[PDB]
Amino acid sequence: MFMINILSLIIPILLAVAFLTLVERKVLGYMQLRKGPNVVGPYGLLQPIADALKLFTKEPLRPATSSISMFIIAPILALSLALTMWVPLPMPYPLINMNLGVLFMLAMSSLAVYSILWSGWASNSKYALIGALRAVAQTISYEVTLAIILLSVLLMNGSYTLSTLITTQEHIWMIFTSWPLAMMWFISTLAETNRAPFDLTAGPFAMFFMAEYANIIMMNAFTAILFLGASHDPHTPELYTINFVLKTLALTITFLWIRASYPRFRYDQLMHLLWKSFLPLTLALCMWHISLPIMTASIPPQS
Amino acid sequence: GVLRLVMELSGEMVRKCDPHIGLLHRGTEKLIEYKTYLQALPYFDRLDYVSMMCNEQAYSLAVEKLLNIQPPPRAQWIRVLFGEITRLLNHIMAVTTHALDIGAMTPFFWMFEEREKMFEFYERVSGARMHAAYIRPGGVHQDLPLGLLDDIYEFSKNFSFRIDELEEMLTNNRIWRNRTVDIGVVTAEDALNYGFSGVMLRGSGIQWDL
Amino acid sequence: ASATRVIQLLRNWASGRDLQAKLQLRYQEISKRTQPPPKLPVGPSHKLSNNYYCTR
Amino acid sequence: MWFEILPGIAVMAACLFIPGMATAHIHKFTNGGKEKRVAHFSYQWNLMERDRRISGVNRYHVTKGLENID
Amino acid sequence: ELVQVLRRGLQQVSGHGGLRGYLRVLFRANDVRVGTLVGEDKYGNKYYEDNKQFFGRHRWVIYTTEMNGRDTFWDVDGSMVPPEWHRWLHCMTDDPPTTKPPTARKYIWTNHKFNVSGTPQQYVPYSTTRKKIQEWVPPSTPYK
Amino acid sequence: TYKFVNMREPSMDMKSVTDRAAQTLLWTELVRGLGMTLSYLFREPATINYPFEKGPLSPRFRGEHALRRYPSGEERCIACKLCEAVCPAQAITIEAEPRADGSRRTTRYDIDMTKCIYCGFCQEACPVDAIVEGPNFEFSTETHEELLYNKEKLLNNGDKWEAEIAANIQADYLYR
Amino acid sequence: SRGEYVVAKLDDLVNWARRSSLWPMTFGLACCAVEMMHMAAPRYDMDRFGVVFRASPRQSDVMIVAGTLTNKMAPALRKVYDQMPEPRYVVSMGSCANGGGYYHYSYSVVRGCDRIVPVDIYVPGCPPTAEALLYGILQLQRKIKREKRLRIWYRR
Ligand SMILES: CCCCCCCCCCCCCCCCC[C@@H](O)O[C@H](CO[C@H](O)CCCCCCCCCCCCCCC)COP(=O)(O)OCC[N+](C)(C)C
Ligand SMILES: CCCCCCCC/C=C\CCCCCCCC(=O)O[C@H](COC(=O)CCCCCCC/C=C/CCCCCCCC)COP(=O)(O)OCCN
Ligand code: SF4
Numbered sequence A: 001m002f003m004i005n006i007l008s009l010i011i012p013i014l015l016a017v018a019f020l021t022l023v024e025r026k027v028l029g030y031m032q033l034r035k036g037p038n039v040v041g042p043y044g045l046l047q048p049i050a051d052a053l054k055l056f057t058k059e060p061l062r063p064a065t066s067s068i069s070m071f072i073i074a075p076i077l078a079l080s081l082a083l084t085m086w087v088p089l090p091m092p093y094p095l096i097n098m099n100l101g102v103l104f105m106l107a108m109s110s111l112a113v114y115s116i117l118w119s120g121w122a123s124n125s126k127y128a129l130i131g132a133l134r135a136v137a138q139t140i141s142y143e144v145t146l147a148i149i150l151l152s153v154l155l156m157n158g159s160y161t162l163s164t165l166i167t168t169q170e171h172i173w174m175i176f177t178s179w180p181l182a183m184m185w186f187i188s189t190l191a192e193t194n195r196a197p198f199d200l201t202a203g204p205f206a207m208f209f210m211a212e213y214a215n216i217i218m219m220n221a222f223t224a225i226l227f228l229g230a231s232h233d234p235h236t237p238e239l240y241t242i243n244f245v246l247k248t249l250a251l252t253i254t255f256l257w258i259r260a261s262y263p264r265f266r267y268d269q270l271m272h273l274l275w276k277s278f279l280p281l282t283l284a285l286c287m288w289h290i291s292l293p294i295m296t297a298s299i300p301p302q303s
Numbered sequence B: 001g002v003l004r005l006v007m008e009l010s011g012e013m014v015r016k017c018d019p020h021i022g023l024l025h026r027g028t029e030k031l032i033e034y035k036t037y038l039q040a041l042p043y044f045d046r047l048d049y050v051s052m053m054c055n056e057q058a059y060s061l062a063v064e065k066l067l068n069i070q071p072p073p074r075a076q077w078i079r080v081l082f083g084e085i086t087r088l089l090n091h092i093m094a095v096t097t098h099a100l101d102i103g104a105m106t107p108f109f110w111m112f113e114e115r116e117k118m119f120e121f122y123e124r125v126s127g128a129r130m131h132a133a134y135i136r137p138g139g140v141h142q143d144l145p146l147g148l149l150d151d152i153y154e155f156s157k158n159f160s161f162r163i164d165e166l167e168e169m170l171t172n173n174r175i176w177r178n179r180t181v182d183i184g185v186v187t188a189e190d191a192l193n194y195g196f197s198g199v200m201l202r203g204s205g206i207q208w209d210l
Numbered sequence C: 001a002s003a004t005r006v007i008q009l010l011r012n013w014a015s016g017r018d019l020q021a022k023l024q025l026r027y028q029e030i031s032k033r034t035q036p037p038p039k040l041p042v043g044p045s046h047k048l049s050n051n052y053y054c055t056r
Numbered sequence D: 001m002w003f004e005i006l007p008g009i010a011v012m013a014a015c016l017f018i019p020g021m022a023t024a025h026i027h028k029f030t031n032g033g034k035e036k037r038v039a040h041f042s043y044q045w046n047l048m049e050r051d052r053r054i055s056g057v058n059r060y061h062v063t064k065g066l067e068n069i070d
Numbered sequence E: 001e002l003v004q005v006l007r008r009g010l011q012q013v014s015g016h017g018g019l020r021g022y023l024r025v026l027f028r029a030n031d032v033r034v035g036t037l038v039g040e041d042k043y044g045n046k047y048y049e050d051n052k053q054f055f056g057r058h059r060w061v062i063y064t065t066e067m068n069g070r071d072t073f074w075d076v077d078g079s080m081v082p083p084e085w086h087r088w089l090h091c092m093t094d095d096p097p098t099t100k101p102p103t104a105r106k107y108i109w110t111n112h113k114f115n116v117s118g119t120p121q122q123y124v125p126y127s128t129t130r131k132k133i134q135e136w137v138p139p140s141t142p143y144k
Numbered sequence F: 001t002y003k004f005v006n007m008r009e010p011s012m013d014m015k016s017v018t019d020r021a022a023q024t025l026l027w028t029e030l031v032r033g034l035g036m037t038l039s040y041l042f043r044e045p046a047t048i049n050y051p052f053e054k055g056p057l058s059p060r061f062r063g064e065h066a067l068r069r070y071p072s073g074e075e076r077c078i079a080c081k082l083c084e085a086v087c088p089a090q091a092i093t094i095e096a097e098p099r100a101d102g103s104r105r106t107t108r109y110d111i112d113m114t115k116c117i118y119c120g121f122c123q124e125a126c127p128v129d130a131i132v133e134g135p136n137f138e139f140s141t142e143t144h145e146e147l148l149y150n151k152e153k154l155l156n157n158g159d160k161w162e163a164e165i166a167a168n169i170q171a172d173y174l175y176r
Numbered sequence G: 001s002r003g004e005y006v007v008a009k010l011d012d013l014v015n016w017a018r019r020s021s022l023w024p025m026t027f028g029l030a031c032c033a034v035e036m037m038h039m040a041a042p043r044y045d046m047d048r049f050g051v052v053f054r055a056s057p058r059q060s061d062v063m064i065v066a067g068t069l070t071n072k073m074a075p076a077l078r079k080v081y082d083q084m085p086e087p088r089y090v091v092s093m094g095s096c097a098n099g100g101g102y103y104h105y106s107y108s109v110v111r112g113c114d115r116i117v118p119v120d121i122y123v124p125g126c127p128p129t130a131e132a133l134l135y136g137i138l139q140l141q142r143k144i145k146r147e148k149r150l151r152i153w154y155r156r
């Protein structure tokens, strides 16, 4: 019954990313003294379905000269990576129990830039290529600090196994052990998914949108598991599932809140932000988190 | 609005910027020559269409100066009141669309509710939300309805909190400051020699207000 | 505006002000949509005498 | 009012309930009512292989107690 | 607190005639508020007010399901309001046409019509004047 | 009298420098802006439920045009052509002649509604209150041709809206 | 029979989906754009009908011409219109776009945007109220609801 498990992982995620559009519209509207969609469906609830059908029945505008191969490949890679990044996560029990699950998620996120590169290349435009290059540069820049912050945090866990993160946070959350790293991690996950204040950039358009929103939800779930450790009772995992889902929803709504609250950076300003504020602090706190367990004789078990 | 902008870039930096205008040239000045003064009044509503009443007042004052007459005191007080209301409308529009273009977008809705209230005032006085054509070169078209002043007072006693919320979203925000500070710096002498007026002068320290 | 006493406290704390004192939404405090007839006085030149146009 | 955002969120929450819960139940069903065995480091895998060989049914989760010691 | 607001929601469900009326109003108007009935319309529109709502929401109309010739269960529009209720509903006056009705005339339409654009009964412009120059008519008789 | 908007000098004592450093490193003003947006979410939206609710209007509002008539049912227009002379947009076209009873009436009265600027000069130029600009604004059309009104269409508009038009004129005529 | 019943229901579904999510791009040429932004302001909240604010041309369902179209601007508007994916609709807002308006007798103004692109709905006014533009958008929705593409294909 492994195929049923794969399907019960894939399908609910796609429904969640479909209704996240509704939630975002509703939340931004109410923060803007108005409503979101409240006409299509009893409480707007049929708006995502109408959006999907309309998008899937509209003419697709193939560039008529661009590389059709990469034009079709880019959304495939984007959505495949987005759906793959959900497999490693333990909610409480993971679909695939990987020893180096964190490294696997890092590698998937690193691949996620080929879709941007290929979509920019296959637009047959100089301006869109400029935009794609900017997006790729921002993404790689911030995944640097994601990797460094992540290993610094994992030094208190003892391994790359994501399940052990539940064991590490049995008594206290990781947010109390390292809140500065969590702050920079949150900003880096904003900048990684091209979300405001870092949003400088028919069918396949919807495919790309689905991939981006799935990446948003997965990144927030990863943040919740990494820094907000729920308590897991082996004889009733549904408590852990509900707690983890609530925390993930809170973080996604916080993304919407941030989008509704701020202006956006310039390109050079966010580049300077990273390279001159996050990287120095990230290196310093990596040094500190290497030294800390040895100084206090609190090194985690697994080797 | 509608704008074409041809520029030359060396990498990130802007080297040259040449704006192309005339995409909204309707030929208003030639059309005015075929109308009477009254018939030519409504063009000034359409000129700067965010501050409709102020445009009307300028034309009316010019025609009054040429006619050698003067509006009565009540008309003048009405004109100054609605000129200040129009200044509120225009500054809301300018600040919130600036912020929207930068990417803030929330104060736009917050303040466009107030803009809707001021269109209610414009509508009560003239029957039209924007192009009122209320200020005529002899005064104003019609008297204020009986309950208008009370509603204006009720509106204007809550607006300071709206400006405060705008400032809380914008003034001390570091992203906003980094987007605005030291951008487009213009000296007083250049502002004067280039024909600037209004805040473009006063932002450079020139003390001038008509 | 009608809101639960707890919602009012939450929104007041988050904003930093008293929201109930100055509300964005208009209520019965506005003027009536039916008003008494006006009278609208006449101007200075409505005299019956000493009002030749060449003097004004 | 704001609570009219709650329906969609609820729907979204229900969707995010489905994967994890499903996994748990499947791990109960294919593992004889117990959590799926974790096998890192290859000593754990050796334990599972020994269990599978001594079950008599080629299934590691069929546990043999003292009733099998004779 | 929470108990009070849930009781008010329950009263809203009760005051629309039960569950069927609740879903009817929710799916026809996307609103389930209850207000005092102000008037019935001869075409079937119903008019409600609630002076504790803020300005703009204190008056509303529930449209009839069948106006002159079309089913209007879903396809409603604002042009279906007759002029007297139009004047009241836009807050041009504080007085509904029930307490004081409009003046009666022999030329005023007894049946209001909605916007008939895109229907066979749409308006088609034409010149309402006669022919200016009329032509010469040759005789029917032979000339030779 | 003039004011200074940005002529403040930050204090350089250790406590003020530490406060600014705490603002930089802990994002205090960003959290303040988030707090205002959160507070602002927890209040009533300003949206009205159109078309079941309508925005406020006034007796003075200028909408679709209408030709009126006297209580006997006889039309007020006397073909004086002042509305046509005053129209800033040249949107009114008029032709007249003596009627069968010798009355001074129009045979043609067109208003091009795609030329009209809805200034209402025509109704304030009329000496008999014949042409008015009524309170209707929901008269959008699917073809250009149906926005070119002739005398029959405008007289129909008058007969259709006479109740509301007369009430509005009663409300507003003492200000004119 | 079932052959026409199935296409009738499927056409109804496609029409509902198309009209319940109308994504407009707006040509804010002149002061009718202020009234369309007032239609997106909190009081009317066009987004609550499924009509998003400021869609991109490559994913736009309807074009709203709001302002005067000058001769200098007409080719750009036609170029933008051609780019849009089909099915595409055009709403003409205000006197200037409907028929030239107050600049009809000008040397530099297009006497109606329907010389350049076909128009589905004409919203009159100078400017139309935001409520009048909302009435026009809902009229376009009803017009979309009336159309029936699958029946024509089945019966041809
Ligand atoms: C599992 C396999 C899925 C495959 C793909 C299928 C797509 C998903 C299926 C679900 C679609 C959801 C349909 C929702 C339609 C109901 C909307 C309803 O409320 O509309 C009303 C009903 O109108 C119409 O009668 C609805 C017709 C919709 C289609 C009817 C049956 C179609 C079923 C065919 C599905 C089979 C597909 C075959 C190939 C996949 C009219 O309201 P409207 O006018 O808007 O709004 C006016 C505004 N007011 C009311 C507030 C004043
Ligand atoms: C005794 C031994 C103790 C061990 C050492 C511990 C000491 C720690 C003290 C300092 C730690 C603070 C570091 C935390 C992060 C600091 C990074 C930073 O401050 O960068 C800012 C910039 O940071 C930002 O502004 C990014 C904001 C982007 C918008 C996003 C809004 C997010 C705010 C809402 C709350 C976010 C919640 C985050 C946590 C979530 C948890 C999952 C500086 O840039 P500028 O002000 O522009 O000037 C630099 C040039 N001089
Ligand atoms: S409202 Fe103005 S533009 Fe329109 S017909 Fe009357 S006078 Fe002419």
Ligand code: SF4
Binding pocket: F076, F077, F078, F079, F080, F081, F082, F083, F084, F094, F125, F126, F127, F128, F129, F130, F131
């Ligand atoms: S409508 Fe009035 S102003 Fe115009 S021609 Fe007739 S009587 Fe004269």
Ligand code: SF4
Binding pocket: B046, B049, F117, G030, G031, G032, G066, G067, G068, G093, G094, G095, G096, G097, G101, G102, G125, G126, G127, G128
């Ligand atoms: S149509 Fe009227 S309101 Fe719109 S831009 Fe032209 S003159 Fe202004």
